[PDB]
Amino acid sequence: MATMEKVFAGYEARQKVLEASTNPFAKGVAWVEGKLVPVNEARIPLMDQGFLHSDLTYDVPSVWDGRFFRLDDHLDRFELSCSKMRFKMPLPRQEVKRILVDMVAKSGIKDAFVEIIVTRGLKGVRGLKAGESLTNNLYMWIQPYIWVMEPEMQRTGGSAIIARTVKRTSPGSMDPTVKNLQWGDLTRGMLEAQDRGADYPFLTDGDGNITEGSGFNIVFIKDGVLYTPDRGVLKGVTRKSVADAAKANGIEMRIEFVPTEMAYQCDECFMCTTAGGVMPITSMDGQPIGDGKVGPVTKEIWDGYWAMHYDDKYSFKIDYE
Amino acid sequence: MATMEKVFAGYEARQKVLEASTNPFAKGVAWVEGKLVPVNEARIPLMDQGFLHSDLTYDVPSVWDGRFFRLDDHLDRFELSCSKMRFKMPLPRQEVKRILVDMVAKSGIKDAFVEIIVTRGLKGVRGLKAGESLTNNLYMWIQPYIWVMEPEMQRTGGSAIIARTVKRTSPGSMDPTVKNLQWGDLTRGMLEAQDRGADYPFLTDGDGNITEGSGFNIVFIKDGVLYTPDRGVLKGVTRKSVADAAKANGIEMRIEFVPTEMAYQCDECFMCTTAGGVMPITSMDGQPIGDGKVGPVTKEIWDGYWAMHYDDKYSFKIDYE
Ligand SMILES: *Cc1c(COP(=O)(O)O)cnc(C)c1O
Ligand SMILES: *Cc1c(COP(=O)(O)O)cnc(C)c1O
């Protein structure tokens, strides 16, 4: 569309400038043990329990056109995730925010993926002896904005399959509201999608309901109403932003059980996530969804989501000096 | 017992020698990108997908009294795990074996924990573009033998709870026969055990059956017969060695559905794993199991397991030169 072309033209112009930069942080920068290092040189201890037992939680805010998007909502969710895991995040919130902004500013990156991780640290829960306390670790980094669905694919939509060989990890085993890197099911789904000649996997709960996919929530549009699963999934900030844009435009959105049959009967579909935004799906199990083009309500939400990036209710300008 | 005292006296004597060594590898040694580094200096790339999405498998053989125990069974299982994950292990099997043995020899460690990991590498499955191929990474290390249950606790047994707040990750989400580091459920179980004043968590499948715990298989003894769960668990090498020792002594062992009620009706119980061996459990949900002492069949298996460490069918001597 018109607004797709706007957003992407601006991104492509900024990318041209960034690709030409000699700033050693232009390809990204990490914070490790209080030091900034270029991201592709960053290393972590082999003995970190975030590696050894994936005992960590994380969050991913973003920067668009030099504006941090919903950073506070990310930090709020991350505090909740840290508490549910019994971590103590090693630096106060305000210091974390200041460091993230300085990192961005230092790098010159205008459109950024940001990741924050807290891990159990160098000593595990399994080994704990009487009297001992654990010190948790923090890792953060900025890189150029990652696209789960590239811009050119967002214009046409991508393809999906309903995964048949795996189901989403039950909340009784791992709470899917705690953003985590334990992607065993998600990775199985990706491999299935590859095998089946589809771009993206949608996992069910194994009981006839749609959940989420490999790093994204799932939204269906049917008879002018948005539907998205309630249980079994991460409470996305992108999905919240979709609800905000729906409300702003008078579009109903239901957060509820979504049966698998919706994937075959929907009028439109899109995935949503911070790394990419609103990502239309125009094929399902090898068949076009309607006419196979990106639908009107999807584009209305798409435009609304990107407009929020310039609204001071949901974003703030970074001073790059 | 008599054989407990034998094994542990030998270990304590060897540990005294190791604690006195100035070898820079005596605290452990890792192999990273073809170089040996002291384990507590070893680092991995932040961008490794083994960290970023826990997209890895691993295995843990061991060395006892300068003898590698069942190394081939570990390498066989690890090949299977690598294939199920669609990894190509970066070095041939024979080279991996030679490197592991050289590492041990170089370190001087007689009683060792060994870990081998293969990860998806520096590029993820999610990001894959048309035409691209992935190169997987290898990490290996040796350290002094880790005890999931310390020697002194093996003499008395430890305590367990049947976990009520978590269930083992279903094979429909993550195959538990592929040894993995995605411990979300296991870590929840450990925290529950701590909360409940018990040493170890036993997880159910959420359908009335016992599975495994936080890095160990679970064995019950009832009316002179060993019972251990079939589905939902890793096919331990320790559990296989238990079956071997049972057979050698005319003790029946059933690998089958184990209802939760067995935890409350058993005559004896033990956990088993490479990092510790045979680990008696003498309390369950806060109540002693029988007289609360380590039982006779448990000790018969315990002695048998350690005898196997000196049998050339199941072990080989390392030349330390
Ligand atoms: C990150 C993520 C999402 C999206 O959450 P956002 O807050 O919108 O970025 C959805 N599901 C999974 C599994 C994720 O990892
Ligand atoms: C390693 C492990 C076991 C034990 O396997 P062994 O081959 O005997 O060391 C059992 N269950 C889990 C979850 C494990 O990680």
Side-chain angles (χ1 to χ4, degrees), chain A residues 42-44 46 52-53 86 128 150 166-167 171-173 181-185 188 194-195, chain B residues 42-44 46 52-53 86 128-129 166-167 171-173 181-185 188 194-195:
Chain A
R43 308 277 174 270
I44 71 162
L46 177 65
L52 294 190
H53 290 107
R86 304 188 185 177
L128 264 187
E150 294 294 333
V166 60
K167 57 175 177 174
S173 297
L181 296 180
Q182 301 191 14
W183 273 34
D185 60 330
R188 280 169 60 172
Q194 266 178 12
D195 289 346
Chain B
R43 308 277 174 270
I44 71 162
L46 177 65
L52 294 190
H53 290 107
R86 304 188 185 177
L128 264 187
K129 295 316 185 271
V166 60
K167 57 175 177 174
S173 297
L181 296 180
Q182 301 191 14
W183 273 34
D185 60 330
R188 280 169 60 172
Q194 266 178 12
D195 289 346

mmCIF file of all heavy atoms in Angstrom, chain A residues 42-44 46 52-53 86 128 150 166-167 171-173 181-185 188 194-195, chain B residues 42-44 46 52-53 86 128-129 166-167 171-173 181-185 188 194-195:
data_model
loop_
_atom_site.group_PDB
_atom_site.id
_atom_site.type_symbol
_atom_site.label_atom_id
_atom_site.label_comp_id
_atom_site.label_asym_id
_atom_site.label_seq_id
_atom_site.Cartn_x
_atom_site.Cartn_y
_atom_site.Cartn_z
ATOM 1 N N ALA A 42 31.070 -10.337 20.856
ATOM 2 C CA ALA A 42 30.583 -10.578 22.198
ATOM 3 C C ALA A 42 30.585 -12.088 22.532
ATOM 4 O O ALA A 42 30.215 -12.960 21.693
ATOM 5 C CB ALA A 42 29.160 -10.042 22.347
ATOM 6 N N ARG A 43 31.024 -12.375 23.759
ATOM 7 C CA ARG A 43 31.116 -13.747 24.247
ATOM 8 C C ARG A 43 30.523 -13.831 25.633
ATOM 9 O O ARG A 43 30.563 -12.852 26.423
ATOM 10 C CB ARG A 43 32.587 -14.180 24.290
ATOM 11 C CG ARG A 43 33.417 -14.007 23.045
ATOM 12 C CD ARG A 43 33.243 -15.126 22.056
ATOM 13 N NE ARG A 43 33.946 -14.882 20.788
ATOM 14 C CZ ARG A 43 33.451 -14.256 19.703
ATOM 15 N NH1 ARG A 43 32.194 -13.780 19.638
ATOM 16 N NH2 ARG A 43 34.242 -14.096 18.642
ATOM 17 N N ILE A 44 30.026 -15.000 25.980
ATOM 18 C CA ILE A 44 29.552 -15.241 27.320
ATOM 19 C C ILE A 44 30.275 -16.439 27.926
ATOM 20 O O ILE A 44 30.770 -17.307 27.201
ATOM 21 C CB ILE A 44 28.053 -15.445 27.353
ATOM 22 C CG1 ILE A 44 27.638 -16.772 26.742
ATOM 23 C CG2 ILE A 44 27.348 -14.268 26.640
ATOM 24 C CD1 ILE A 44 26.218 -17.186 27.155
ATOM 25 N N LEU A 46 31.064 -20.004 29.175
ATOM 26 C CA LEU A 46 30.551 -21.335 28.908
ATOM 27 C C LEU A 46 29.728 -21.873 30.068
ATOM 28 O O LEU A 46 28.747 -22.579 29.864
ATOM 29 C CB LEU A 46 31.685 -22.308 28.640
ATOM 30 C CG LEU A 46 31.385 -23.769 28.399
ATOM 31 C CD1 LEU A 46 30.594 -24.049 27.142
ATOM 32 C CD2 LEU A 46 32.732 -24.491 28.303
ATOM 33 N N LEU A 52 23.883 -23.352 30.007
ATOM 34 C CA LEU A 52 23.937 -24.738 30.467
ATOM 35 C C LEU A 52 22.594 -25.410 30.728
ATOM 36 O O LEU A 52 22.489 -26.643 30.670
ATOM 37 C CB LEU A 52 24.847 -24.876 31.704
ATOM 38 C CG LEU A 52 26.365 -24.586 31.474
ATOM 39 C CD1 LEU A 52 27.203 -24.999 32.689
ATOM 40 C CD2 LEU A 52 26.900 -25.328 30.264
ATOM 41 N N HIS A 53 21.596 -24.651 31.118
ATOM 42 C CA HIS A 53 20.243 -25.162 31.355
ATOM 43 C C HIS A 53 19.160 -24.214 30.852
ATOM 44 O O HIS A 53 18.036 -24.275 31.306
ATOM 45 C CB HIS A 53 20.005 -25.517 32.841
ATOM 46 C CG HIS A 53 20.771 -26.723 33.242
ATOM 47 N ND1 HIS A 53 21.881 -26.646 34.036
ATOM 48 C CD2 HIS A 53 20.711 -28.008 32.786
ATOM 49 C CE1 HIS A 53 22.463 -27.837 34.098
ATOM 50 N NE2 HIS A 53 21.765 -28.684 33.370
ATOM 51 N N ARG A 86 12.100 -16.216 39.674
ATOM 52 C CA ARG A 86 12.896 -15.921 40.886
ATOM 53 C C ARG A 86 14.299 -15.370 40.628
ATOM 54 O O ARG A 86 15.262 -15.730 41.319
ATOM 55 C CB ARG A 86 12.956 -17.119 41.826
ATOM 56 C CG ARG A 86 11.597 -17.586 42.193
ATOM 57 C CD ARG A 86 11.621 -18.639 43.260
ATOM 58 N NE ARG A 86 10.262 -19.124 43.466
ATOM 59 C CZ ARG A 86 9.968 -20.095 44.312
ATOM 60 N NH1 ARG A 86 10.934 -20.658 44.991
ATOM 61 N NH2 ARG A 86 8.711 -20.482 44.460
ATOM 62 N N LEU A 128 23.013 -26.267 44.218
ATOM 63 C CA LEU A 128 22.986 -25.456 45.438
ATOM 64 C C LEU A 128 23.202 -26.230 46.749
ATOM 65 O O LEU A 128 22.461 -27.174 47.038
ATOM 66 C CB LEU A 128 21.645 -24.733 45.534
ATOM 67 C CG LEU A 128 21.559 -23.300 45.027
ATOM 68 C CD1 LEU A 128 20.184 -22.753 45.405
ATOM 69 C CD2 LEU A 128 22.665 -22.377 45.553
ATOM 70 N N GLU A 150 10.296 -10.351 5.885
ATOM 71 C CA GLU A 150 10.958 -9.264 5.206
ATOM 72 C C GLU A 150 9.918 -8.307 4.595
ATOM 73 O O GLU A 150 8.819 -8.727 4.202
ATOM 74 C CB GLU A 150 11.882 -9.815 4.090
ATOM 75 C CG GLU A 150 13.059 -10.621 4.563
ATOM 76 C CD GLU A 150 14.064 -9.811 5.350
ATOM 77 O OE1 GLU A 150 14.153 -8.591 5.139
ATOM 78 O OE2 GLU A 150 14.827 -10.411 6.143
ATOM 79 N N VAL A 166 4.053 -31.506 16.038
ATOM 80 C CA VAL A 166 4.450 -30.931 17.306
ATOM 81 C C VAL A 166 3.278 -30.093 17.806
ATOM 82 O O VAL A 166 2.484 -29.586 17.006
ATOM 83 C CB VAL A 166 5.729 -30.091 17.106
ATOM 84 C CG1 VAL A 166 5.490 -28.966 16.117
ATOM 85 C CG2 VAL A 166 6.329 -29.573 18.419
ATOM 86 N N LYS A 167 3.232 -29.892 19.118
ATOM 87 C CA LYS A 167 2.258 -29.008 19.763
ATOM 88 C C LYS A 167 2.999 -28.092 20.719
ATOM 89 O O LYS A 167 4.072 -28.420 21.153
ATOM 90 C CB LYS A 167 1.220 -29.796 20.520
ATOM 91 C CG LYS A 167 1.719 -30.762 21.614
ATOM 92 C CD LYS A 167 0.602 -31.434 22.414
ATOM 93 C CE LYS A 167 1.177 -32.418 23.401
ATOM 94 N NZ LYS A 167 0.085 -32.946 24.250
ATOM 95 N N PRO A 171 1.409 -24.883 29.335
ATOM 96 C CA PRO A 171 1.736 -24.022 30.498
ATOM 97 C C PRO A 171 2.030 -24.808 31.794
ATOM 98 O O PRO A 171 2.723 -24.287 32.686
ATOM 99 C CB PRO A 171 0.515 -23.133 30.634
ATOM 100 C CG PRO A 171 -0.101 -23.154 29.271
ATOM 101 C CD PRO A 171 0.096 -24.546 28.759
ATOM 102 N N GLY A 172 1.575 -26.047 31.858
ATOM 103 C CA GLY A 172 1.935 -26.915 33.005
ATOM 104 C C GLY A 172 3.348 -27.430 33.048
ATOM 105 O O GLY A 172 3.735 -28.020 34.049
ATOM 106 N N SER A 173 4.089 -27.258 31.939
ATOM 107 C CA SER A 173 5.499 -27.550 31.827
ATOM 108 C C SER A 173 6.363 -26.301 31.783
ATOM 109 O O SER A 173 7.424 -26.234 32.421
ATOM 110 C CB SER A 173 5.718 -28.392 30.564
ATOM 111 O OG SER A 173 4.994 -29.655 30.732
ATOM 112 N N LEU A 181 13.672 -18.889 25.876
ATOM 113 C CA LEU A 181 14.467 -19.287 24.687
ATOM 114 C C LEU A 181 14.450 -20.797 24.546
ATOM 115 O O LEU A 181 15.271 -21.360 23.808
ATOM 116 C CB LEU A 181 15.857 -18.668 24.747
ATOM 117 C CG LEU A 181 15.863 -17.116 24.676
ATOM 118 C CD1 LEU A 181 17.301 -16.577 24.736
ATOM 119 C CD2 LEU A 181 15.108 -16.614 23.448
ATOM 120 N N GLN A 182 13.561 -21.451 25.275
ATOM 121 C CA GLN A 182 13.461 -22.889 25.215
ATOM 122 C C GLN A 182 12.528 -23.247 24.044
ATOM 123 O O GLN A 182 11.374 -23.555 24.210
ATOM 124 C CB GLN A 182 13.003 -23.497 26.536
ATOM 125 C CG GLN A 182 13.999 -23.115 27.655
ATOM 126 C CD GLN A 182 13.785 -23.890 28.934
ATOM 127 O OE1 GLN A 182 13.072 -24.898 28.976
ATOM 128 N NE2 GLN A 182 14.464 -23.405 30.012
ATOM 129 N N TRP A 183 13.094 -23.185 22.841
ATOM 130 C CA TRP A 183 12.277 -23.227 21.577
ATOM 131 C C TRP A 183 12.130 -24.611 20.968
ATOM 132 O O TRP A 183 11.879 -24.720 19.795
ATOM 133 C CB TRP A 183 12.890 -22.288 20.553
ATOM 134 C CG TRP A 183 12.432 -20.856 20.638
ATOM 135 C CD1 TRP A 183 12.089 -20.141 21.755
ATOM 136 C CD2 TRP A 183 12.191 -20.009 19.518
ATOM 137 N NE1 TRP A 183 11.680 -18.864 21.368
ATOM 138 C CE2 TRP A 183 11.723 -18.778 20.006
ATOM 139 C CE3 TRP A 183 12.401 -20.154 18.121
ATOM 140 C CZ2 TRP A 183 11.408 -17.709 19.166
ATOM 141 C CZ3 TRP A 183 12.060 -19.107 17.301
ATOM 142 C CH2 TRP A 183 11.588 -17.887 17.826
ATOM 143 N N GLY A 184 12.242 -25.651 21.753
ATOM 144 C CA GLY A 184 12.250 -26.992 21.167
ATOM 145 C C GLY A 184 11.081 -27.299 20.261
ATOM 146 O O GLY A 184 11.264 -27.813 19.162
ATOM 147 N N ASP A 185 9.884 -26.945 20.728
ATOM 148 C CA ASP A 185 8.680 -27.079 19.959
ATOM 149 C C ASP A 185 8.616 -26.163 18.779
ATOM 150 O O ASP A 185 8.208 -26.607 17.665
ATOM 151 C CB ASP A 185 7.436 -26.893 20.862
ATOM 152 C CG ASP A 185 7.348 -25.551 21.551
ATOM 153 O OD1 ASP A 185 8.400 -24.932 21.855
ATOM 154 O OD2 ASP A 185 6.168 -25.237 21.894
ATOM 155 N N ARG A 188 11.051 -27.416 16.119
ATOM 156 C CA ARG A 188 10.375 -28.569 15.440
ATOM 157 C C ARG A 188 9.372 -28.022 14.425
ATOM 158 O O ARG A 188 9.271 -28.501 13.285
ATOM 159 C CB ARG A 188 9.705 -29.564 16.411
ATOM 160 C CG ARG A 188 10.676 -30.536 17.038
ATOM 161 C CD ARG A 188 10.034 -31.288 18.163
ATOM 162 N NE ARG A 188 8.864 -32.086 17.850
ATOM 163 C CZ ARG A 188 8.278 -32.928 18.714
ATOM 164 N NH1 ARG A 188 8.838 -33.140 19.921
ATOM 165 N NH2 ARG A 188 7.173 -33.610 18.387
ATOM 166 N N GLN A 194 9.469 -26.010 6.835
ATOM 167 C CA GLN A 194 10.445 -26.186 5.756
ATOM 168 C C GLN A 194 10.085 -27.448 4.942
ATOM 169 O O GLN A 194 10.023 -27.410 3.708
ATOM 170 C CB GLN A 194 11.887 -26.447 6.293
ATOM 171 C CG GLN A 194 12.843 -25.308 6.476
ATOM 172 C CD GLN A 194 14.218 -25.761 7.059
ATOM 173 O OE1 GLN A 194 14.559 -26.959 7.141
ATOM 174 N NE2 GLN A 194 14.996 -24.795 7.475
ATOM 175 N N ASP A 195 9.901 -28.546 5.630
ATOM 176 C CA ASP A 195 9.607 -29.842 5.006
ATOM 177 C C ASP A 195 8.360 -29.760 4.119
ATOM 178 O O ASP A 195 8.198 -30.523 3.134
ATOM 179 C CB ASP A 195 9.331 -30.926 6.022
ATOM 180 C CG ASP A 195 10.564 -31.382 6.799
ATOM 181 O OD1 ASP A 195 11.666 -31.053 6.394
ATOM 182 O OD2 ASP A 195 10.363 -32.120 7.806
ATOM 183 N N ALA B 42 36.623 -20.385 29.659
ATOM 184 C CA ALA B 42 35.996 -20.695 28.391
ATOM 185 C C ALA B 42 34.766 -19.792 28.139
ATOM 186 O O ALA B 42 33.942 -19.509 29.058
ATOM 187 C CB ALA B 42 35.548 -22.155 28.366
ATOM 188 N N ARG B 43 34.672 -19.334 26.889
ATOM 189 C CA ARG B 43 33.589 -18.452 26.467
ATOM 190 C C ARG B 43 33.018 -18.943 25.158
ATOM 191 O O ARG B 43 33.732 -19.549 24.318
ATOM 192 C CB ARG B 43 34.126 -17.026 26.290
ATOM 193 C CG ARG B 43 34.896 -16.408 27.429
ATOM 194 C CD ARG B 43 34.012 -15.813 28.488
ATOM 195 N NE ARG B 43 34.763 -15.338 29.659
ATOM 196 C CZ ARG B 43 35.077 -16.054 30.756
ATOM 197 N NH1 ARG B 43 34.704 -17.335 30.930
ATOM 198 N NH2 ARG B 43 35.793 -15.469 31.716
ATOM 199 N N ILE B 44 31.757 -18.644 24.929
ATOM 200 C CA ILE B 44 31.138 -18.942 23.662
ATOM 201 C C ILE B 44 30.560 -17.673 23.046
ATOM 202 O O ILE B 44 30.248 -16.714 23.759
ATOM 203 C CB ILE B 44 30.071 -20.007 23.800
ATOM 204 C CG1 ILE B 44 28.836 -19.496 24.521
ATOM 205 C CG2 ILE B 44 30.654 -21.244 24.521
ATOM 206 C CD1 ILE B 44 27.610 -20.389 24.284
ATOM 207 N N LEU B 46 28.079 -14.944 21.910
ATOM 208 C CA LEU B 46 26.745 -14.526 22.300
ATOM 209 C C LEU B 46 25.700 -14.911 21.265
ATOM 210 O O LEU B 46 24.573 -15.247 21.610
ATOM 211 C CB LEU B 46 26.686 -13.022 22.497
ATOM 212 C CG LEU B 46 25.375 -12.357 22.845
ATOM 213 C CD1 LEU B 46 24.811 -12.747 24.193
ATOM 214 C CD2 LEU B 46 25.624 -10.846 22.835
ATOM 215 N N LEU B 52 21.019 -18.634 22.028
ATOM 216 C CA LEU B 52 19.906 -17.772 21.638
ATOM 217 C C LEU B 52 18.537 -18.439 21.558
ATOM 218 O O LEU B 52 17.504 -17.769 21.692
ATOM 219 C CB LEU B 52 20.211 -17.033 20.321
ATOM 220 C CG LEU B 52 21.379 -15.996 20.371
ATOM 221 C CD1 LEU B 52 21.426 -15.145 19.097
ATOM 222 C CD2 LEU B 52 21.242 -15.057 21.555
ATOM 223 N N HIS B 53 18.496 -19.712 21.237
ATOM 224 C CA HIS B 53 17.253 -20.485 21.174
ATOM 225 C C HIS B 53 17.405 -21.892 21.739
ATOM 226 O O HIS B 53 16.632 -22.769 21.411
ATOM 227 C CB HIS B 53 16.670 -20.535 19.742
ATOM 228 C CG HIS B 53 16.133 -19.216 19.327
ATOM 229 N ND1 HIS B 53 16.777 -18.426 18.415
ATOM 230 C CD2 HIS B 53 15.128 -18.458 19.853
ATOM 231 C CE1 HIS B 53 16.178 -17.244 18.354
ATOM 232 N NE2 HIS B 53 15.165 -17.243 19.196
ATOM 233 N N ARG B 86 18.546 -32.816 13.312
ATOM 234 C CA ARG B 86 19.129 -32.429 12.008
ATOM 235 C C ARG B 86 20.437 -31.641 12.085
ATOM 236 O O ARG B 86 20.657 -30.695 11.315
ATOM 237 C CB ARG B 86 18.117 -31.702 11.131
ATOM 238 C CG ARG B 86 16.890 -32.513 10.936
ATOM 239 C CD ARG B 86 15.957 -31.909 9.930
ATOM 240 N NE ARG B 86 14.733 -32.700 9.896
ATOM 241 C CZ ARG B 86 13.697 -32.387 9.139
ATOM 242 N NH1 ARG B 86 13.760 -31.316 8.392
ATOM 243 N NH2 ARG B 86 12.619 -33.154 9.147
ATOM 244 N N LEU B 128 16.670 -18.298 8.165
ATOM 245 C CA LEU B 128 17.166 -18.878 6.913
ATOM 246 C C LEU B 128 16.543 -18.305 5.630
ATOM 247 O O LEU B 128 15.319 -18.332 5.472
ATOM 248 C CB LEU B 128 16.920 -20.385 6.923
ATOM 249 C CG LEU B 128 18.058 -21.298 7.360
ATOM 250 C CD1 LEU B 128 17.624 -22.740 7.103
ATOM 251 C CD2 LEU B 128 19.397 -21.013 6.671
ATOM 252 N N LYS B 129 17.392 -17.800 4.725
ATOM 253 C CA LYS B 129 16.939 -17.348 3.396
ATOM 254 C C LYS B 129 17.169 -18.451 2.353
ATOM 255 O O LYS B 129 17.973 -19.359 2.561
ATOM 256 C CB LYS B 129 17.633 -16.041 3.016
ATOM 257 C CG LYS B 129 17.254 -14.858 3.933
ATOM 258 C CD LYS B 129 15.731 -14.786 4.225
ATOM 259 C CE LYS B 129 15.284 -13.561 5.024
ATOM 260 N NZ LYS B 129 15.328 -13.755 6.507
ATOM 261 N N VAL B 166 4.125 -28.630 38.446
ATOM 262 C CA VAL B 166 4.684 -28.733 37.114
ATOM 263 C C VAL B 166 4.589 -30.197 36.698
ATOM 264 O O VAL B 166 4.599 -31.092 37.551
ATOM 265 C CB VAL B 166 6.140 -28.221 37.132
ATOM 266 C CG1 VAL B 166 6.993 -29.043 38.080
ATOM 267 C CG2 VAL B 166 6.771 -28.130 35.737
ATOM 268 N N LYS B 167 4.581 -30.425 35.390
ATOM 269 C CA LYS B 167 4.626 -31.768 34.807
ATOM 270 C C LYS B 167 5.694 -31.790 33.730
ATOM 271 O O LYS B 167 6.034 -30.763 33.202
ATOM 272 C CB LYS B 167 3.296 -32.150 34.208
ATOM 273 C CG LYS B 167 2.715 -31.225 33.120
ATOM 274 C CD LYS B 167 1.425 -31.742 32.480
ATOM 275 C CE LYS B 167 0.887 -30.739 31.491
ATOM 276 N NZ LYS B 167 -0.279 -31.328 30.792
ATOM 277 N N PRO B 171 6.358 -35.457 25.176
ATOM 278 C CA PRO B 171 7.112 -35.783 23.941
ATOM 279 C C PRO B 171 6.528 -35.141 22.664
ATOM 280 O O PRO B 171 7.261 -34.956 21.678
ATOM 281 C CB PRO B 171 7.067 -37.298 23.889
ATOM 282 C CG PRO B 171 6.824 -37.701 25.310
ATOM 283 C CD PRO B 171 5.895 -36.671 25.871
ATOM 284 N N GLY B 172 5.266 -34.749 22.715
ATOM 285 C CA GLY B 172 4.674 -33.997 21.583
ATOM 286 C C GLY B 172 5.111 -32.568 21.417
ATOM 287 O O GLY B 172 4.770 -31.954 20.413
ATOM 288 N N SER B 173 5.811 -32.027 22.430
ATOM 289 C CA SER B 173 6.441 -30.727 22.406
ATOM 290 C C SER B 173 7.954 -30.801 22.291
ATOM 291 O O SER B 173 8.577 -30.035 21.541
ATOM 292 C CB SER B 173 6.041 -29.974 23.681
ATOM 293 O OG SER B 173 4.588 -29.788 23.658
ATOM 294 N N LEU B 181 18.849 -29.216 26.985
ATOM 295 C CA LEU B 181 19.140 -28.282 28.101
ATOM 296 C C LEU B 181 17.949 -27.368 28.322
ATOM 297 O O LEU B 181 18.077 -26.337 28.998
ATOM 298 C CB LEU B 181 20.460 -27.561 27.860
ATOM 299 C CG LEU B 181 21.700 -28.498 27.849
ATOM 300 C CD1 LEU B 181 22.985 -27.690 27.606
ATOM 301 C CD2 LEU B 181 21.774 -29.336 29.121
ATOM 302 N N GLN B 182 16.819 -27.712 27.728
ATOM 303 C CA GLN B 182 15.627 -26.913 27.875
ATOM 304 C C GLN B 182 14.908 -27.371 29.156
ATOM 305 O O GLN B 182 13.952 -28.106 29.130
ATOM 306 C CB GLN B 182 14.730 -26.975 26.644
ATOM 307 C CG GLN B 182 15.511 -26.478 25.406
ATOM 308 C CD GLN B 182 14.632 -26.244 24.200
ATOM 309 O OE1 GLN B 182 13.401 -26.196 24.287
ATOM 310 N NE2 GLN B 182 15.310 -26.058 23.032
ATOM 311 N N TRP B 183 15.425 -26.898 30.287
ATOM 312 C CA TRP B 183 15.036 -27.452 31.631
ATOM 313 C C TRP B 183 13.917 -26.694 32.324
ATOM 314 O O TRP B 183 13.805 -26.764 33.522
ATOM 315 C CB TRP B 183 16.257 -27.485 32.532
ATOM 316 C CG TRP B 183 17.106 -28.724 32.421
ATOM 317 C CD1 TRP B 183 17.346 -29.489 31.311
ATOM 318 C CD2 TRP B 183 17.751 -29.371 33.515
ATOM 319 N NE1 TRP B 183 18.153 -30.570 31.672
ATOM 320 C CE2 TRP B 183 18.392 -30.516 33.015
ATOM 321 C CE3 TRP B 183 17.912 -29.042 34.887
ATOM 322 C CZ2 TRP B 183 19.138 -31.372 33.826
ATOM 323 C CZ3 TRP B 183 18.623 -29.906 35.682
ATOM 324 C CH2 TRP B 183 19.249 -31.050 35.147
ATOM 325 N N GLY B 184 13.077 -26.014 31.588
ATOM 326 C CA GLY B 184 12.083 -25.160 32.239
ATOM 327 C C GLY B 184 11.233 -25.850 33.280
ATOM 328 O O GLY B 184 11.054 -25.335 34.379
ATOM 329 N N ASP B 185 10.744 -27.038 32.925
ATOM 330 C CA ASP B 185 9.995 -27.870 33.825
ATOM 331 C C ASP B 185 10.808 -28.416 34.955
ATOM 332 O O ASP B 185 10.330 -28.409 36.128
ATOM 333 C CB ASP B 185 9.297 -29.015 33.051
ATOM 334 C CG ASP B 185 10.234 -29.938 32.305
ATOM 335 O OD1 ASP B 185 11.324 -29.498 31.859
ATOM 336 O OD2 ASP B 185 9.735 -31.081 32.074
ATOM 337 N N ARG B 188 11.565 -25.584 37.402
ATOM 338 C CA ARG B 188 10.319 -25.382 38.209
ATOM 339 C C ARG B 188 10.257 -26.455 39.295
ATOM 340 O O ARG B 188 9.938 -26.184 40.463
ATOM 341 C CB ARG B 188 9.024 -25.358 37.369
ATOM 342 C CG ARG B 188 8.771 -24.031 36.694
ATOM 343 C CD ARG B 188 7.670 -24.140 35.686
ATOM 344 N NE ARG B 188 6.368 -24.564 36.164
ATOM 345 C CZ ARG B 188 5.257 -24.561 35.413
ATOM 346 N NH1 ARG B 188 5.297 -24.053 34.166
ATOM 347 N NH2 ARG B 188 4.087 -25.003 35.891
ATOM 348 N N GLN B 194 12.718 -27.203 46.714
ATOM 349 C CA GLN B 194 13.281 -26.266 47.691
ATOM 350 C C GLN B 194 12.152 -25.740 48.604
ATOM 351 O O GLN B 194 12.277 -25.747 49.834
ATOM 352 C CB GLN B 194 13.885 -24.994 47.017
ATOM 353 C CG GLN B 194 15.342 -24.940 46.674
ATOM 354 C CD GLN B 194 15.749 -23.607 45.972
ATOM 355 O OE1 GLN B 194 14.996 -22.612 45.917
ATOM 356 N NE2 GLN B 194 16.936 -23.601 45.425
ATOM 357 N N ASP B 195 11.099 -25.253 47.998
ATOM 358 C CA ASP B 195 9.963 -24.664 48.718
ATOM 359 C C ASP B 195 9.372 -25.654 49.728
ATOM 360 O O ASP B 195 8.776 -25.266 50.763
ATOM 361 C CB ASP B 195 8.830 -24.276 47.796
ATOM 362 C CG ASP B 195 9.128 -23.063 46.917
ATOM 363 O OD1 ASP B 195 10.095 -22.370 47.184
ATOM 364 O OD2 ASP B 195 8.316 -22.826 45.977
#
